[PDB]
Amino acid sequence: SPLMVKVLDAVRGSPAINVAVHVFRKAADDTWEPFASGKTSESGELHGLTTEEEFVEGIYKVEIDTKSYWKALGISPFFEHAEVVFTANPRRYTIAALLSPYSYSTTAVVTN
Amino acid sequence: SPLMVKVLDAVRGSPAINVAVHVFRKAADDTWEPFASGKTSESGELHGLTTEEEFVEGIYKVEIDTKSYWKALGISPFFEHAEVVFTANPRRYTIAALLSPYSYSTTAVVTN
Amino acid sequence: SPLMVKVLDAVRGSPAINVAVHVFRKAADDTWEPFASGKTSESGELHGLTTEEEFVEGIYKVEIDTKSYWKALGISPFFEHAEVVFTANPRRYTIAALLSPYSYSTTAVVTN
Amino acid sequence: SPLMVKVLDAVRGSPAINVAVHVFRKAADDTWEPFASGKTSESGELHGLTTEEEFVEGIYKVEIDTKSYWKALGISPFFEHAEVVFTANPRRYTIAALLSPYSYSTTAVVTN
Numbered sequence: 001s002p003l004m005v006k007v008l009d010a011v012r013g014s015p016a017i018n019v020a021v022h023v024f025r026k027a028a029d030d031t032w033e034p035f036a037s038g039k040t041s042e043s044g045e046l047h048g049l050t051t052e053e054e055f056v057e058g059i060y061k062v063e064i065d066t067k068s069y070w071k072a073l074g075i076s077p078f079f080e081h082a083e084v085v086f087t088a089n090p091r092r093y094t095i096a097a098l099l100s101p102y103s104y105s106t107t108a109v110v111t112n
Numbered sequence: 113s114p115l116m117v118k119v120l121d122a123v124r125g126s127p128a129i130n131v132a133v134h135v136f137r138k139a140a141d142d143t144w145e146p147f148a149s150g151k152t153s154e155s156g157e158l159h160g161l162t163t164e165e166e167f168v169e170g171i172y173k174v175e176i177d178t179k180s181y182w183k184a185l186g187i188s189p190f191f192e193h194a195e196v197v198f199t200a201n202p203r204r205y206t207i208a209a210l211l212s213p214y215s216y217s218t219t220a221v222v223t224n
Numbered sequence: 225s226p227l228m229v230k231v232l233d234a235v236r237g238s239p240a241i242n243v244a245v246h247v248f249r250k251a252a253d254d255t256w257e258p259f260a261s262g263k264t265s266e267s268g269e270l271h272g273l274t275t276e277e278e279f280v281e282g283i284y285k286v287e288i289d290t291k292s293y294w295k296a297l298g299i300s301p302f303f304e305h306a307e308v309v310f311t312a313n314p315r316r317y318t319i320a321a322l323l324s325p326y327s328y329s330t331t332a333v334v335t336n
Numbered sequence: 337s338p339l340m341v342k343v344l345d346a347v348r349g350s351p352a353i354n355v356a357v358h359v360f361r362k363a364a365d366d367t368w369e370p371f372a373s374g375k376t377s378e379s380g381e382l383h384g385l386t387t388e389e390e391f392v393e394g395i396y397k398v399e400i401d402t403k404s405y406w407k408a409l410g411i412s413p414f415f416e417h418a419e420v421v422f423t424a425n426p427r428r429y430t431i432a433a434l435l436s437p438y439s440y441s442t443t444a445v446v447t448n
Contacts, residue, residue, distance in 0.1 A: 008432070011235060013302055013326030013446045044445075059192075078220050078237055080171075083195035096344070098443055100324055102237030105217040105441060107434055108190050109380075110349045120320070123347060125334045125414055125438030156333075190349055208232070210331055212436055214349030217329060219322055221268075222237045283416075302444050304395075307419035329441040332414050 002055045003036075003093050005046040005062065010100040012073070015044025019069045019099075023049060026059040035060065057089045064097055066104070077101035084108075114167045115148075115205050117158040117174065122212040124185070127156025131181045131211075135161060138171040147172065169201045176209055178216070189213035196220075226279045227260075227317050229270040229286065234324040236297070239268025243293045243323075247273060250283040259284065281313045288321055290328070301325035308332075338391045339372075339429050341382040341398065346436040348409070351380025355405045355435075359385060362395040371396065393425045400433055402440070413437035420444075 003023070007016040019040040024032035036050045063083045070077040082104040084095065094109040115135070119128040131152040136144035148162045175195045182189040194216040196207065206221040227247070231240040243264040248256035260274045287307045294301040306328040308319065318333040339359070343352040355376040360368035372386045399419045406413040418440040420431065430445040 008443055008445055010324045010327035010443055013444045015445065015447070078198050078222065079218075080197045080199065082218070083197075084216065085192045085195075086190050087192065098327065098441070100234045100327070102222070103217070103219040103234035103322065103324070104196065105215070105329070105434070106191075106194070107215040107344055107346055108349045109344055109351065110190065110214070111351070120331055120333055122331055122436045122439035125332045127333065127335070210329070210439065212346045212439070215346035215434065215436070217322070217441070219232055219234055220237045221232055221239065223239070302422050302446065303442075304421045304423065306442070307421075308440065309416045309419075310414050311416065326446070327441070327443040328420065329439070330415075330418070331439040334414065334438070 001047060001049045002052050002091055003049050004095070005040070005049065005064070006094060006096045007040050007044050007046075007064065008096075008098050010098050010103070011075075015042065016040060016069060016099050017042050017044060018072070019044075020065040021046050021049075022063040022065070024061040024063070026061075032061055052091075055088065057087075059085060059087050061085045062095050064104075066099055069099070070101055075101055079104055082106065113159060113161045114164050114203055115161050116207070117152070117161065117176070118206060118208045119152050119156050119158075119176065120208075120210050122210050122215070123187075127154065128152060128181060128211050129154050129156060130184070131156075132177040133158050133161075134175040134177070136173040136175070138173075144173055164203075167200065169199075171197060171199050173197045174207050176216075178211055181211070182213055187213055191216055194218065225271060225273045226276050226315055227273050228319070229264070229273065229288070230318060230320045231264050231268050231270075231288065232320075232322050234322050234327070235299075239266065240264060240293060240323050241266050241268060242296070243268075244289040245270050245273075246287040246289070248285040248287070250285075256285055276315075279312065281311075283309060283311050285309045286319050288328075290323055293323070294325055299325055303328055306330065337383060337385045338388050338427055339385050340431070341376070341385065341400070342430060342432045343376050343380050343382075343400065344432075344434050346434050346439070347411075351378065352376060352405060352435050353378050353380060354408070355380075356401040357382050357385075358399040358401070360397040360399070362397075368397055388427075391424065393423075395421060395423050397421045398431050400440075402435055405435070406437055411437055415440055418442065
C-alpha cells in the first residue's frame with residue numbers, strides 16, 4: 001500500500017491498537033468521497049489501506065477517530081478526531097500520529 | 113472570546129502570523145456549518161473569534177489552513193490543512209497548534 | 225527576561241503549574257554550570273528567569289523536571305525530565321514545552 | 337536490543353538518517369556514564385544499541401545530537417541536541433523522536 005498509517009498512544013506509551021482511520025479523496029465537484037478505511041493492528045500500524053492502481057493523484061484527507069479508542073480504554077477524551085489534508089502526486093506515504101486526550105501530533109514520512 | 117487559537121511555526125521558530133483559521137459547528141442535520149473564522153495576529157494569536165452568548169454547547173471543528181501560510185513564506189508544504197473536532201459543554205478553550213510542512217501538533221488548554 | 229519558559233499538560237489539557245525548570249550555561253572548561261532556575265506559575269509560564277545583562281552569548285541547557293510534577297498529580301511518569309541545548313547569540317527566546325508521562329515536545333519561539 | 341531509537345525529520349518528511357544517539361546510565365556516584373551509542377540507519381532506526389544482559393535496571397539518559405545532522409543537510413539549527421531521562425525496571429523500549437531546527441518531540445513506546 002502506497003499509503004500507511006501508524007498511531008501511538010502518548011498517555012500509555014504503547015501502539016494505539018484498533019484505531020479507526022478513514023481516508024477521503026476530493027471529487028471533481030469538491031466533495032470528500034470515501035476512499036479507504038481500516039483499523040490499526042496490535043503494532044499500531046494500518047496496512048493494506050489502498051494500492052498503487054487505486055491511489056491516483058488527488059487531494060486526500062486522513063481522518064483518525066479517537067473518541068471510540070479512548071472510551072474502550074476508559075477515557076472520555078477532549079479531542080474526538082483529527083484530520084489532515086495533503087496532495088498526492090516520492091511514492092510511499094506514512095502518516096504517523098501520536099494520540100492524547102487533549103493533544104494530537106501527525107507527521108508525514110514520504111519515501112521511495 | 114471563550115475560544116482562542118494560537119499558532120507557532122516550528123521551521124522558523126516564530127509565531128505563525130496571518131494563518132487562516134475556520135471554525136464549524138455541527139448542525140441538527142449532521143452538517144458542518146460555518147461558525148467563526150479569523151487570521152492570526154503578529155503574536156500568532158487569534159482573538160475575538162466568538163463570544164459566550166454565541167459559543168453554545170455543540171460539536172465544533174477547528175480547521176487551520178497551512179497552504180497559504182507556507183507559500184507566502186516561500187514554502188510549498190505537504191500538509192495543507194489540519195482539523196480537530198471536540199465537544200463544548202471549564203469555559204475557556206485555547207487550541208495551540210505547531211506548524212511544519214510535514215507535521216502538525218495541536219493541543220487544547222481548557223481553563224476557567 | 226530574555227529567556228521565558230512555558231509548559232502545558234497534554235493529559236489534563238491545562239497549564240502545567242509548579243513545574244521546576246533549571247537552566248545551565250556551558251563554562252570555559254566544558255562543564256554545565258547552574259545559571260538560573262524557577263517554577264512555572266498558574267498560567268504555566270516562568271517569568272523573571274534571567275536578565276539581558278546576565279544572559280550573555282553562550283551554550284545553554286534548559287532542563288524541565290517532570291517527575292515531581294506528575295507525582296503531585298497522582299501520576300508516576302515514564303519520562304522523568306527533558307533537556308534541550310541551544311546557543312544564544314533575535315533577542316527574546318521562549319521555550320514552550322508540552323508534557324505527557326510518555327512524551328514531551330519542546331519548541332523555541334525566538335522574537336524581537 | 338531492549339532499547340531502540342527511531343528518528344524522523346519534520347522539515348523534509350523523511351527518516352532522519354545518520355543521527356548520532358548517545359545513551360548514558362547513572363552511576364552509583366550520581367554521574368552519567370557512557371552506556372551505548374550509535375547512528376540511525378536509512379530507515380531512521382538505530383538497532384543493536386544494547387542487549388538484555390547489559391541493559392540492567394537503572395536511570396538512563398538518551399541524547400540525540402541534531403547539530404551535525406542539520407548541518408550536513410545545509411541547515412544551522414537552533415536546537416542542538418535533545419535529552420530525555422527515564423528509569424528502566426514491559427521490556428522493550430522504543431524512543432521515537434521527531435526533529436525540526438526549532439522543535440523536538442520524543443515519545444516512549446514500551447512493549448513486551
